[PDB]
Amino acid sequence: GSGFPTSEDFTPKEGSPYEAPVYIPEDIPIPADFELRESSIPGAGLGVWAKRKMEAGERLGPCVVVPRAAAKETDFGWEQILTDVEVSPQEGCITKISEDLGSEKFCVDANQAGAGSWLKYIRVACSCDDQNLTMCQISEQIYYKVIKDIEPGEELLVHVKEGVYPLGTVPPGLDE
């Protein structure tokens, strides 16, 4: 039986009988400014707690760096952001290199660690007095934009939704 050391007869433990404990072997890379942990807070659920503070104008990332023609499902809070031919002229927008935030002149902890799935954990604020959550959609990629300063110990960042995605914060009749 998978999940427990059975030790009954000469039954080969085939097929990789593995089960995920409290600490998952995935271990998704996250920015050091935020901690990912299972902590069910009544009214929200699980989220990534900022162990550090932020001041108004901050944005959580990276989530996804997926361009226009990167095969989007259908809608994530608009209708279809792939409404522009991504020709991408090779006379300007190329970026074959990547600026690394290392020990040169980069006292910024960004574009280093962060698969992106870490940002889908943050949910709607437990209380309407704690509303400080807004979704940002730029360059056809997803970011969580914070409203005002964050104090270490509260994660309120979500795409406001009252159905699935669209009518939550965007007009369901965009561009008429």
Residue length of the chain: 176
E strands present in 33-107? 34-41, 45-50, 59-60
State both tokens at 171: 């007009």
> Which residues, including other chains, have CB under 8 Å from residue 77's CB and lie 6 or more apart?
135, 137, 159, 161, 165, 166, 168, 169, 170
> Are 46 and 29 a contacting pair, CB within 8 Å?
no
**How far is the C-alpha of 154 from the C-alpha of 26, rounded, in Å?**
24
> Which residues, including other chains, have CB under 8 Å from residue 111's CB and lie 6 or more apart?
62, 98, 99, 100, 101
Q: What is the Cα Rg of the chain in Å?
A: 21
- CA distances 113 to 61, 96, 102, 123, Å, are 10, 20, 12, 21
> Are 72 and 126 a contacting pair, CB within 8 Å?
no
Does an H or E element contain 141, and which? strand 141-146
**How far is the C-alpha of 103 from the C-alpha of 90, rounded, in Å?**
30
Cα within 13 Å of Cα(155), Cβ side: 27
Cα within 13 Å of Cα(50), Cβ side: 18
E strands present in 19-131? 34-41, 45-50, 59-60
Cα within 13 Å of Cα(33), Cβ side: 19
- Select from 140, 135, 137, 116 the least CA-distant residue to 124: 135
State both tokens at 61: 């990332």
Look at the block and give the residue holding tokens 């574009």.
Answer: 111
**How far is the C-alpha of 30 from the C-alpha of 48, rounded, in Å?**
9
Q: How many CB atoms lie within 10 A of CB 3?
A: 8
Cα within 13 Å of Cα(109), Cβ side: 11
**How far is the C-alpha of 58 from the C-alpha of 110, rounded, in Å?**
12
